[PDB]
Scaffold this active site. Structure first.
Site, short mmCIF file in Angstrom:
data_model
loop_
_atom_site.label_atom_id
_atom_site.label_comp_id
_atom_site.label_asym_id
_atom_site.label_seq_id
_atom_site.Cartn_x
_atom_site.Cartn_y
_atom_site.Cartn_z
N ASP A 94 -14.29 0.74 -8.98
CA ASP A 94 -13.31 -0.31 -8.76
C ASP A 94 -12.78 -0.80 -10.11
O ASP A 94 -13.51 -0.83 -11.10
CB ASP A 94 -13.90 -1.48 -7.96
CG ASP A 94 -12.84 -2.42 -7.43
OD1 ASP A 94 -11.64 -2.13 -7.59
OD2 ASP A 94 -13.22 -3.46 -6.84
N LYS A 139 29.87 -1.76 7.49
CA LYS A 139 30.43 -0.43 7.35
C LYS A 139 31.12 0.03 8.64
O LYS A 139 32.18 0.67 8.59
CB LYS A 139 29.33 0.56 6.96
CG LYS A 139 29.79 1.99 6.75
CD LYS A 139 28.65 2.85 6.23
CE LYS A 139 27.64 3.13 7.34
NZ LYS A 139 26.58 4.07 6.88
#
Ligand SMILES: Nc1ncnc2c1ncn2[C@H]1C[C@H](O)[C@@H](COP(=O)(O)OP(=O)(O)OP(=O)(O)O)O1
Ligand SMILES: Cc1cn([C@H]2CC[C@@H](COP(=O)(O)O)O2)c(=O)[nH]c1=O
Ligand SMILES: [Mg+2]
Length: 1011
Positions: free
Chosen positions: A137, A536
């Site tokens: 870790d 659009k």
DNA sequence: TCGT
DNA sequence: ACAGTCTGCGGCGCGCGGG
DNA sequence: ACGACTACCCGCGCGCCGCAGACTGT
């Protein structure tokens, strides 16, 4: 002299004699002659009904060239032994892993580097752990830099802690953790381990690594699935836990358990949730904020607590692994899966630093320059409007400005005192007050997406001013006399309630009321409302005069919406990539080739990016990466679409790659053809195998010519039809492709196509519900029948399904379509794993200088030296013919068509782009890129350096040691349930094209079974 | 999750 | 030292676009 | 209440509803 082509009863060409000898060895069939005759009569009846009998196909001279020998009598044995070969040490290290955990030191020492703690002995200083398996870790101060700050590791016998010199007196934050991954084979287990792998010193090498980083999150998503069906099932989860949080006593067994058992068999991705599910462990997460600080001194204190936090995370991850890992072996027992996971766990992206920085600046400057001017102009228009308060005639007379609220705010005045009511804009109109959110705001904040934008910029739909109605969105008024004419135009009439509101407000204003309100059409559906008009989908309406505006700014604004939108979605993540240069670390960037062979420049700029890839992030076991698996292709208008062209190759190297053709359609046709045991037994399969892409005779191209559409739109239309999409949505797709069409024509084309494709439907007692009379009815019935099996397994390999989608955990909610789609989508992943295993075996056997660079779904790219480039291309062509035959043999057929055996095009290039002939000119890039090369099988075979060379003797002897176990194909197990006469009568009913014939066949079957 |  | 009366903040859903 | 649906991922921006918090008013 020349060999004669070999043809089956249908007009399809099989492979040549040499390739048949080398791939399938010696095989024979003809086990059921009478049944084959009956299945041929039915297939001929279907083909003559759909009119494909006697049609000319493509005939070509047989190809013949030597191939590497196989390692087994069949393909399954060969693949089993290769898969066992590719991961021997790693799997044996994954097993025998420790269960007991050693104690931890009472105190921790702050010393730069690696320190080893053993219980009962004094701590020592080590260069690097020298351990086969560790749990690891990393913790980092992200605000200050991207480099790590501390790290913790655990093994069977000791504890290990790594500390950066930055917190030990130094002022240089650049440092990477050493693990010596180029010399020792090791396995590193972690949760979201891709984050940790980017912080290892010896992963920044072009030479291949010997370490394997394994992620528990993929093991959780694959088996014990998250239940991420992207459906209310995901949503109903948070509501159930919210209800559980609300009431402490939860009697869920009365209703929630009964209807929805699946709520109790799964959890979320996060480590706290996964731990809580598999084990009774609670993980408090309150100390992460300490790593959000910008002062290193806060790190110096509280050191013991932070190290104990990291150790607790390590212990929790280890116990989660101990529970999850055995289950994945039960669900996915074939050796190829683990090897493919290991192959997809390693990826590297070469690049250059200064070009990356120049691209990053040039992609932001134009975006900000475009945005600022239009926002300032619209602010100026608002300022011009906001001085008409004094004169009532113009804001009452004007049709558009009457809609805005003009009421003045109430003022509260105290006697002999200040008001102090936190008043905003005294003596000002309500809307201008709504522009300012707070007292602090001195300048209005506005965007082109604002609702008041069609009120500011005046807009007319068919010479009628737009009006706003709370229920029906945007509407346009129509005179009473012409209403029937608009009925010809198919405009829908607005809600009567909105009509009453409009006439009431107009009568309040005056002039009584005339006309009727009609809703503006919305592209998604007739019933859906409309809330925006600058998107659009309305762009073609701006042309042709349907939608008009006096101002020229609107024509500007839509283009701006086109230009930057993707950047607006992706500006952050692209500017968050971790790029490491050569200058900082001068003993790391070593060449792939062991011989240096010169190729050293005058201090050239090389950099490397390690992608953060989750190998199985989907319920169909597909990879998920946020940035490079969502990158856009290059386009002339779009800004920043040249992202994938930043990946470059160092001097003396290149990229070799390929893409699969019609991948999910070929698999779907083969499932349908497996009943007749002949390629081309169904009409859809015959249409799929008629032609090739190089000649332009593929099925997708033919669909496009009939519908007058591009090839991508045809692919969308076909894949929508294969899964469950109604004809109504297909009509809207046809309207979307060609806007200048009426609705009725689209409805007729869609209905006729669906009638010719699917056919009709019959419901009966003995035979539940089926389709008949269509060219693809067999596939639609087959997908449902395999989807209703009690235990569903992938056909090629045999992988299982997550517990969330099993039938026994479902009682009311069905979630049916994903179960149908899952088998094909998982078969694609199996296809990719098979090619990765074959490529790894060939590269190891023939000693090629190559490694996997990137793998998008259905696409593989490799980094190859100049000397062996064509050989690498040869290594591709051998792989695919191995995989496709593997598909055929598992389903019963021992033959393969010649046209589908090889890749159409193999690409050799210096950068990554879709086509080798693209200039890739964007608004940000003004320089063309020189083209690359694409090749086919004959042109590759004409090259003189294509041949592989001498093999190595050790590899075959190592492979031969392993063992092989015979297994039974899953479809043979499925076939056992059905009695044989059922299959004959059911298929005979399916091939019929009339109700009376089907009813007669049912009558004959019932009389036969009765007596 | 919604249609009829 | 209690009881109305406004005035911002914060989370969530839904459109809208890329593969 | 029985039938009818394209499938799988990743993110941003804007409007709406539910509450803390200060100001009068006794
Ligand atoms: N809109 C979609 N709906 C469903 N599945 C899709 C869709 N688009 C793509 N797919 C599937 C089909 C393929 O297996 C994969 C995409 O591969 P892709 O290369 O786009 O198509 P393809 O392999 O069928 O054709 P090509 O011949 O162009 O390679 O995902
Ligand atoms: C557009 C699209 C993409 N993909 C996946 C497969 C291909 C990969 C790259 O796609 P192409 O490079 O655009 O993304 C899907 O699964 N469904 C889709 O609709
Ligand atoms: Mg493809």
């Amino acid at each position: 002299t020349a060999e004669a082509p070999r043809i089956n009863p249908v007009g399809i060409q099989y492979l040549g004699e040499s390739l048949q000898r080398q791939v399938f060895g010696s095989c024979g069939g003809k086990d059921e002659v009478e049944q084959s005759d009956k299945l041929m009569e039915l297939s001929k009846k279907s083909l003559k009904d759909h009119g494909l009998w006697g049609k000319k196909t493509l005939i070509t001279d047989p190809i013949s060239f030597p191939l590497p020998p196989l390692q087994g009598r069949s393909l399954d044995e060969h693949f089993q032994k290769i898969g066992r070969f590719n991961s021997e040490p790693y799997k044996s290290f994954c097993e025998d892993k420790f269960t007991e955990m050693v104690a931890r030191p009472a105190e921790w020492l702050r010393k730069p580097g690696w320190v080893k703690y053993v219980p009962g002995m004094a701590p020592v200083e080590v260069a690097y752990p020298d351990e086969e398996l560790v749990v690891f870790d990393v913790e980092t101060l992200y605000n200050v830099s991207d480099y790590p700050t501390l790290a913790t590791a655990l093994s069977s016998t000791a504890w290990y802690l790594w500390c950066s010199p930055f917190i030990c007196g130094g002022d240089d934050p650049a440092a990477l953790i050493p693990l010596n991954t180029l010399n020792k084979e090791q396995v590193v287990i972690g949760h979201n381990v891709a984050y940790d792998r980017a912080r290892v010193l010896e992963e920044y090498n072009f030479r291949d690594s010997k370490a394997f980083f394994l992620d528990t999150q993929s093991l959780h998503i694959a088996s014990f699935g998250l239940c991420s069906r992207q459906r209310p099932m995901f949503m109903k989860n948070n509501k159930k836990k919210e209800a559980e949080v609300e009431s402490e006593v939860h009697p869920e067994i009365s209703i929630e358990d009964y209807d929805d058992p699946w709520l109790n068999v799964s959890a979320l991705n996060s480590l706290k949730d996964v731990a809580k599910f598999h084990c009774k462990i609670d993980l408090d997460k309150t100390d992460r904020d300490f790593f959000a600080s910008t002062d290193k001194s806060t790190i110096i204190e509280n050191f013991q607590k932070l190290v104990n936090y990291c150790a607790t995370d390590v212990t929790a991850t280890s116990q989660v692994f101990d529970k999850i890992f055995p289950v994945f072996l039960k669900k996915c027992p074939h050796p190829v899966s683990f090897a493919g996971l290991k192959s997809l766990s390693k990826c590297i992206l070469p690049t250059k630093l200064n070009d990356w920085n120049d691209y990053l600046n040039s992609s932001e400057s134009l975006y900000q320059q475009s945005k600022v001017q239009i926002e300032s102009k619209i602010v100026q228009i608002i300022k011009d409007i906001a001085l008409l308060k004094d004169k009532p005639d113009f804001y009452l007379k004007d049709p558009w400005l009457s809609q805005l609220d003009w009421t003045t705010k109430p003022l509260r005045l105290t006697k002999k005192g200040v008001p102090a009511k936190c008043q905003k804009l005294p003596g000002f109109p309500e809307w201008y007050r709504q522009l300012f959110p707070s007292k602090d705001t001195v300048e209005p904040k506005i965007t082109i997406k604002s609702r008041i934008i069609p009120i500011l910029f005046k807009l007319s739909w068919e010479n009628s001013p737009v009006i706003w109605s709370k229920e029906s969105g945007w509407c346009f008024n129509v005179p009473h006399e012409q209403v029937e004419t608009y009925k010809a135009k198919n405009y829908v009439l607005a809600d009567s309630v909105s009509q009453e509101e409009e006439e009431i407000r107009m009568n309040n204003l005056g002039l009584q009321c005339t006309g009727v309100l009609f809703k503006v059409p919305h592209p998604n559906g007739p019933t859906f409302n409309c809330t925006n008009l600058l998107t659009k989908s309305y762009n073609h309406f701006f042309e042709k005069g349907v939608l008009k505006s006096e101002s020229e700014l609107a024509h500007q604004a839509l283009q701006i919406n086109s230009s930057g939108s993707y950047w607006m979605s992706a500006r952050e993540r692209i500017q968050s990539q971790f790029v490491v240069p050569n200058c900082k670390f001068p003993n790391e960037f070593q060449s792939l080739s062991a011989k240096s062979s010169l190729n050293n420049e005058k201090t050239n700029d090389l950099a490397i990016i390690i992608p953060k890839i989750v190998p199985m992030g989907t319920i169909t076991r597909r990879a998920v990466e946020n940035t490079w698996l969502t990158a856009s292709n290059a386009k002339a208008n779009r800004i920043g679409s040249e992202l994938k062209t930043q990946v470059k190759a160092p001097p003396g190297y290149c990229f070799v790659g390929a893409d699969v053709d019609s991948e999910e359609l070929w698999i779907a046709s083969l499932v349908g053809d497996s009943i007749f045991n002949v390629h081309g037994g169904t009409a859809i399969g015959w249409m799929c195998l008629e032609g090739t892409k190089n000649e332009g005779t593929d099925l997708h191209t033919k669909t496009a010519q009939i519908l007058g559409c591009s090839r991508n739109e045809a692919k969308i239309f076909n894949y929508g039809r294969i899964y469950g999409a109604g004809a109504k949505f297909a009509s809207q797709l046809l309207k979307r492709f060609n806007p200048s069409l009426t609705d009725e024509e689209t409805k007729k084309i869609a209905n006729k196509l669906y009638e010719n494709t699917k056919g009709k439907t019959k419901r009966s007692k003995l035979f539940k519900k089926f389709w008949y009379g269509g060219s693809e009815s067999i596939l639609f019935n087959k997908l449902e029948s395999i989807a209703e099996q009690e235990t569903p397994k992938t056909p090629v390999l045999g992988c299982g399904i997550t517990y969330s989608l099993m039938k026994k955990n479902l009682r009311a909610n069905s979630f049916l379509p994903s179960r149908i789609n899952w088998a094909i989508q998982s078969s694609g992943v199996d296809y990719l794993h098979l090619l990765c295993c074959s490529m790894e075996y060939i590269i190891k056997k023939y000693n090629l200088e190559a490694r996997l660079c990137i793998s998008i779904h259905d696409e593989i790219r490799f980094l190859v030296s100049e000397k062996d480039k064509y050989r690498a291309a040869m290594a591709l062509q051998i792989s695919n013919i191995w995989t496709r035959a593997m598909f055929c043999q598992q389903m019963g057929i021992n033959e393969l068509p010649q046209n589908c055996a090889f890749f159409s095009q193999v690409d050799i290039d210096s950068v990554i782009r879709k086509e080798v002939n693209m200039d890739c000119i964007t608004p940000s890039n003004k320089t063309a890129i020189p083209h690359g090369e694409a090749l086919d099988i004959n042109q590759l075979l004409d090259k003189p350096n294509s041949k592989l060379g001498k093999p190595s003797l050790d590899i075959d002897s190592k492979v031969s040691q392993y063992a092989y176990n015979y297994r039974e194909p899953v479809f043979e197990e499925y076939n056992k349930s059905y009695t044989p006469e059922f299959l004959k009568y059911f298929l005979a009913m399916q091939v019929q094209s009339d109700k009376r014939d089907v009813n007669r066949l049912e009558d004959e079957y019932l009389r036969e079974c009765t007596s």
